[PDB]
């Protein structure tokens, strides 16, 4: 018989969660799977404008799922049934500010610029960093292909999750909380098993799962190589057809290691990449134009 | 044989301030100085063992304003590298994690097989049971340097009596190892000398060395909380007697510089 | 219907306790008594190694009990039935660290040196300094003599309590908490009443209840005189048979007062001692050897 | 607690020509180096004990040409001199005897009382259980020097678990010492002669000593089967390391000739 009209504020709250057992079952068309995953942690921000982190929802996405990749390699089509996102805090009540989660149906779209247009997305949620909240995504009934090669994201992907936080104090906690996913997936058509590696060249051709991305921003060339995961096993090898000024430089990353030379006309390099944070790149190769060659990237 | 139940302390956790997580591993075999402290004396007179109960407990000692998370997990393959990212860590079955101002209990199921208790060259898939991983990733700058403690509750069975194994470690500079695994010897450059990696925690580690010829310098302290050498080294025949107190694993407390392959003898004893 | 899966941390906790009535009853063999006592308070420690306080459990112990001494003077044998120890805090949740309580069956044994061997004692308890906990000691059925004169502690005593605390911060509370005892005692054989004073000499002879202790650590002699209680009534008088260099000095104590001289061959001194903390001594007498004389110590 | 069963060897017997017997004694306590060699490690972690079985055996190793008698007895008072006549030896209950080429078994009944383990100084009537007496009197002139061996079969239980005791012995030339009772030190007269006696049988005895001042002589073997010293002696602060092999009781190396009450430090370790 506590007082309803009066509320109290504690120093901190503790949430306890243990490991859950995934469920796999068979049916007439294919298999159904139920499980849970962890995405990432959140950091503080001392400005008055938000900073965004994004995640694309596809079954063949190494940056989002970890154990669904092995069972998604035997099939071609998918359909989601249930999708929930959960936030878990790690900070006391002295921390002030807000955190926000939103979901959009267009995968190929930049994040919004200001705070006013962020609140115009349907179904957005926001809270204080010392409490938990749940976002539930409704689903439709449409079968889509799995992501391989290069295609329009409007044809194969389901949507994208956006996470943001803007306003904290000068002396505050370094990390805020973590985000988990509960999913239910259906699979349709069996096929032979496929390889897990990314092979491509510099003329916009990709023939594998989405692991890395390339950008030009050409001032005396200079090619950027952005990674999308944290799997710490990234091995990259590159073949040169003509003379290159420099290759295999460390732009901004935790560690770098290269073996062979690059000053030959026909030469193969080999590098190992350690990644600690999302979007960090460990390659910067300058040329005089867009060159001819072949690159291969592999996890573990 | 005999049956014994008990509770022992392993180690204390420390504050982690950088972006990447930190992992510590522990191998569960009765002949391990880095895991047990009293079972190693009764395990030196037997050949086989079996576990019937196993549990792990975390006990906090940090204030309520300390933010972060600690994690514990157990796996079956004793010969495996530790994971890189957190998502592969949370995919291990039975993993637990909590805020550092509260406690939690990890329970491990057991089977009924008999394995050899020994230290040597043999396969870890044949003689070991599993491995424990403890992970700490996110803390701040204005937080306490100590978080908590980990303890083990167990029940074990031993089978066949045999002759007793010696408790001190005897060796020399050209690599020959026998006895309990208490310390490791490493070298980087022949001119620079050797590093003395004490891979266990304790007090009153007694080390004595013999020099068969002249040495440039000996007895240098690097990362010891306390150091005391009472016997000097001079010319052809001399001995040394050093007492080292060690706080954390792999400090590398003793440094001696000589030529490439000197002759001598070293004895290491715990307490 | 509170949330089981979520816990809260308050600023402070308050425990309230009032005085309890002891129970005395008679039987065929003797009398039985039930009551409660207070031992001492605990202080902070900024090191990483524990500091210990000990208490010997005997009915004729002035340092442990206060009102059982008067009823234990009429009897010779005893047997315990119930023994419990309780801790009560006085500090908020900002204080970090641990406190520990343990019990051992050997009265004549030094405390352990490190933290690892402290946890090997059966039935030890430990907690944070802003909560309470209870230690219960099981008992056996063996009659023992009361403590008078000089005897082996293995023959007359029951056991010893050890209290410790090791790790606190630089800016913290000065005092941590307090310890109370609940007991049940049986008494057996009636006898005439005995005196309450301690009379002895320097050749290892004691003829009374344990109030003080003597130690030599002979460098140009120098006799230490340690007190075991806080009863503030300690009067000590000493007779000299030969010439003494100095007598009746204040080593480390709150107050000291001496009346007569000591530079005579046959002389009697008289001192009053104020004690604020356990183990503080207020006497330091240098000689050339172990001397011949007589000392008497009395409370109040 | 725990319950153990074991079998250990005490000593071997020698011949005696004169018809008056020669007596050897053994005090039965779990914390006794002169009777047990493996039980002391388990006894160092507990406080109370009870025996439930106790037997003794004799195993001959002499030919049938050798004639005479050997005799065994047990008494329940640990502080008592041995008898000076044979009829008082035969008045003890359970006395057994035979010719030295045949064996026999002695069985001792037990009682259910709890006793403390033995510290350095205490009363023998409070902590001990009894004492074993072995006697030989009659042998021929042309006979073998060795007669037989005595073994113990036991069953014991331990109750109260406590902290552990360090296995090495640390001491100095004054009258203070600590640890288990491995060796004993004494002095004889104003001219410095120091006697060093070992109370156990074993080849693993390692002794290291420190000299604060100059010593005229050190490390001279007196009655050992083998003696080995590796470090020299100097007038300044210097250590000396020695390895001792012990065959019989009271056999040791003893050479200190510096002062009546010198300054130094010694460490004794077994195995």
CA distance C37 to C22: 10
Pairing of strands B146-158, C125-127: unpaired
CB B86 within 8 A of CB B21: yes
The beta-strand segments (E) located in A2-151 are 13-15, 23-26, 31-43, 51-57, 77-89, 99-104, 125-127, 134-137, 144-145
CA distance A300 to A62: 12
**C153: region left, alpha or beta (phi > 0 left; psi from -120 to 50 alpha):** alpha
Distances (CA, A) of A45 to A97, A173, A230, B199, D145: 10, 10, 22, 41, 91
Resolved by: cryo-EM
CB D257 within 8 A of CB D216: yes
Tokens 């499980």 locate to: A35
**CA B64 to mean position of chain CA atoms:** 30
Helices marked H in B115-253? 124-127
CB B253 within 8 A of CB B222: yes
CA distance C58 to C159: 8
Length of chain D counted residue by residue: 271
Residues 6+ away with beta carbon under 8 Å from A245: A286, A287, A288
CA distance D85 to B179: 51
CB B197 within 8 A of CB B250: yes
CA distance C96 to B100: 12
CA distance A231 to A64: 11
3 state DSSP class of D155: strand
Token pair of D69 as six digits: 């008698």
Tokens 């009853």 locate to: C25
CA distance D144 to D66: 8
Q: Which residues pair with B221 in a beta bridge?
A: B254
Q: C-alpha angle with apex A240: A239 to A246, nearest 5 degrees?
A: 115
HSE of D218, CA atoms in CB hemisphere, 13 A = 23
Q: Phi and psi dihedrals of B126, rounded to 5? A: -100, -30
Alpha-carbon radius of gyration of chain D: 21
CA distance D255 to D244: 14
- Which helix (H) or strand (E) element contains residue A117? helix A115-118
Do A and D have ≥3 inter-chain CB pairs under 8 A?
Answer: no
Interface B-C, measured as beta-carbon pairs within 8 A, has a size of 29
3 state DSSP class of A164: strand
- The shortest C-alpha distance from D238 to chain C (Å) reads 28
CA distance B225 to C72: 51
Token pair of B97 as six digits: 């994690």
Q: Which one, of B233, B194, B192, lies nearest residue B215 by Cα?
A: B233
Instruction: Report chain D residues whose CB lies below 8 A from the CB of C154.
Output: 116, 122, 126
CA distance D107 to D51: 13
Percentage helix, strand, coil, to 5, in chain A? Answer: 5, 40, 55
- Which helix (H) or strand (E) element contains residue D12? strand D2-14
CA distance C1 to B29: 46
What secondary structure letter does DSSP report for B88? H
Tokens 């493996």 locate to: D38
Q: Phi and psi dihedrals of A116, rounded to 5? A: -70, -40
Which strands form B131-136's sheet, in the order they lie side by side?
B22-27, B131-136, B70-75, B96-98
Token pair of A198 as six digits: 């990314």
3 state DSSP class of A115: helix
**CA C230 to mean position of chain CA atoms:** 9
Q: Which residues pair with A53 in a beta bridge?
A: A163
- Longest Cα–Cα distance in chain C: 82
Q: Neighbours of D (≥3 Cβ pairs closer than 8 A)? A: B, C
Token pair of A232 as six digits: 């710490």
Q: Which one, of D151, D184, D145, lies nearest residue D61 by Cα?
A: D145
CA distance A14 to B67: 11
Helices marked H in chain C? 68-71, 115-118, 153-156
3 state DSSP class of B87: helix
Residues 6+ away with beta carbon under 8 Å from A58: A64, A146, A147, A156, A157, A158
Tokens 């004054």 locate to: D174
HSE of A130, CA atoms in CB hemisphere, 13 A = 18
The per-residue DSSP string of D66-106 comes to ----EEEEEES-SS-PPPSSHHHHTTSTT-EEE-TTS--EE
CA distance B7 to A217: 62
Q: Which one, of D98, D138, D136, D135, lies nearest residue D18 by Cα?
A: D138
CB C102 within 8 A of CB C53: no
CA distance C32 to B199: 57
Token pair of A95 as six digits: 């921390």
Q: Which residues pair with B172 in a beta bridge?
A: B176
Pairing of strands C144-145, C77-89: antiparallel
3 state DSSP class of D182: coil
**D110: region left, alpha or beta (phi > 0 left; psi from -120 to 50 alpha):** beta
Residue of C nearest to A13 (CA): C8
CA distance C188 to C74: 10
CB D198 within 8 A of CB D185: no
Tokens 């510099």 locate to: A202
Tokens 């006395």 locate to: D95
CA distance A294 to A133: 46
CA distance D36 to D44: 13
Q: Which residues pair with C83 in a beta bridge?
A: C137, C183
Burial B79-109 (b: 16+ CB within 10 A, else e): eeeebbbbbebbbeeebbbbbbbbebebebe
Q: C-alpha angle with apex D162: D158 to D168, nearest 5 degrees?
A: 100
What secondary structure letter does DSSP report for C74? G
Residue of B nearest to A276 (CA): B20
Q: Which one, of A55, A52, A128, A118, lies nearest residue A85 by Cα?
A: A55
Q: Which one, of D183, D162, D153, lies nearest residue D42 by Cα?
A: D162
3 state DSSP class of D258: coil
The residues on B that touch D, with CB distances below 8 Å, are 2-4, 38, 41-42, 45, 164, 166-168, 206, 208, 210, 230-232, 237-241, 265, 269, 271
Q: Which one, of B247, B45, B36, lies nearest residue B154 by Cα?
A: B36
Tokens 């000291």 locate to: C256
Q: Phi and psi dihedrals of B45, rounded to 5? A: -115, 10
Helices marked H in B121-261? 124-127
Residues 6+ away with beta carbon under 8 Å from A62: A69, A209, A210, A211, A228, A229, A231, A299
CA distance B213 to B231: 16
Q: Phi and psi dihedrals of B232, rounded to 5? A: -85, 170
CB C296 within 8 A of CB C236: yes
CB C123 within 8 A of CB C135: yes
CB A196 within 8 A of CB A299: yes
Q: Neighbours of B (≥3 Cβ pairs closer than 8 A)? A: A, C, D
Sign of CA dihedral C192, C196, C200, C204: positive
Q: Which one, of A57, A50, A159, A54, lies nearest residue A99 by Cα?
A: A50
Give the CA dihedral D199, D202, D203, D209, nearest 10 degrees: -30
Please return the burial class of A128, using the count of CB atoms within 10 Å of its CB with bins 0-12, 13-18 and 19+: middle
Give the CA dihedral A217, A221, A224, A225, nearest 10 degrees: 130
CB B48 within 8 A of CB B159: yes
The residues on B that touch C, with CB distances below 8 Å, are 7-9, 37-38, 59-65, 101-102, 144, 146, 203
CA distance A269 to A248: 8
Give the CA dihedral B202, B206, B212, B216, nearest 10 degrees: 70
Contact check, Cβ <8 Å, A10/C10: yes
Residues 6+ away with beta carbon under 8 Å from C24: C31, C32, C33, C34, C71
Q: Which one, of A271, A274, A270, lies nearest residue A253 by Cα?
A: A274
3 state DSSP class of C252: coil
**D67: region left, alpha or beta (phi > 0 left; psi from -120 to 50 alpha):** beta
- Which helix (H) or strand (E) element contains residue B217? strand B217-221
Contact check, Cβ <8 Å, D163/C121: yes
CA distance B94 to C241: 78
The beta-strand segments (E) located in chain C are 6-8, 23-26, 31-43, 51-57, 77-89, 99-104, 125-127, 134-137, 144-145, 159-165, 175-187, 198-201, 205-206, 212-215, 223-227, 234-240, 255-258, 267-274, 281-285, 293-298
Pairing of strands C175-187, C31-43: antiparallel
The beta-strand segments (E) located in D105-236 are 105-107, 115-116, 131-136, 146-158, 169-171, 177-178, 183-187, 194-198, 202-211, 226-229
CA distance C27 to C42: 39
Q: Which one, of D264, D100, D110, D124, lies nearest residue D196 by Cα?
A: D264
Contact check, Cβ <8 Å, A171/B142: yes
Q: How many Cβ atoms from other residues are within 10 Å of residue A261's Cβ?
A: 11
Alpha-carbon radius of gyration of chain B: 21
- Longest Cα–Cα distance in chain A: 82
3 state DSSP class of A74: helix
Q: How many Cβ atoms from other residues are within 10 Å of residue B11's Cβ?
A: 15
CA distance A139 to A6: 40
Contact check, Cβ <8 Å, B64/C128: no
The per-residue DSSP string of C129-187 comes to TTS--EEEE------EE---SS--HHHH--EEEEEEE----SS--SEEEEEEEEEEEEE
CA distance C48 to C168: 8
Tokens 């004729």 locate to: C60
Q: Which one, of B182, B243, B152, lies nearest residue B34 by Cα?
A: B182
Give the one of C7, C97, C116 whose C-beta lies nearest to B9's C-beta: C116
Residues 6+ away with beta carbon under 8 Å from C65: C37, C59
The per-residue DSSP string of D18-72 comes to SSS-EEEEEE--TT-TTT-SSHHHHHTTBSEEEEEEEEEEEEE-S-TT----EEE
């Amino acid at each position: 018989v506590q007082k309803v009209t009066r509320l109290s504020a504690p120093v901190a709250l503790a949430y306890r969660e243990v490991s859950t057992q995934p469920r796999v079952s068979t049916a007439r068309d294919g298999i159904t799977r139920s499980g849970s995953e962890l995405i990432t942690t959140l950091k503080k921000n001392t400005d008055t404008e938000p900073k965004y982190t994004t995640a694309v929802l596809n079954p063949s996405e190494p940056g989002t799922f970890n154990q669904l990749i092995k069972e998604a390699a035997q099939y071609e089509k998918y359909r989601f049934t249930s999708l929930r996102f959960r936030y878990s805090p790690m900070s006391p009540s002295t921390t002030g500010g807000k955190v926000a989660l939103a979901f959009d149906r267009d995968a190929a779209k930049p994040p919004p610029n200001d705070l006013a247009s962020l609140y115009n997305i349907e179904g957005c949620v926001s809270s204080v960093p010392w409490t938990g909240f749940i976002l539930t995504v409704p689903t439709d009934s449409t079968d889509r292909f799995v992501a391989d090669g290069i295609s329009d994201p409007k044809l194969v992907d389901f949507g994208k999750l956006i996470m943001a936080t803007y306003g904290q104090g000068a002396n505050d906690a370094a990390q805020l909380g973590e985000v988990r996913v509960e999913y239910t997936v259906q699979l349709k058509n069996r096929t032979g098993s496929t390889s897990d590696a990314q092979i491509g060249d510099f003329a916009g051709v990709k023939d594998g799962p989405r692991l890395v991305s390339w950008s030009k921003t050409k001032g005396t060339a200079g090619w950027e190589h952005d990674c999308h995961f944290l799997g710490t096993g990234n091995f990259s090898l590159t073949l040169f057809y003509e003379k290159a000024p420099v290759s295999g430089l460390e732009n901004a990353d935790a560690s770098d290691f290269s073996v062979l030379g690059e000053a030959a006309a026909g030469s193969v390099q080999w590098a190992g990449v350690k990644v600690a944070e999302r979007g960090q790149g460990v390659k910067m190769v300058t040329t005089e134009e867009q060159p001819k060659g072949k690159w291969q990237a592999l996890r573990i």
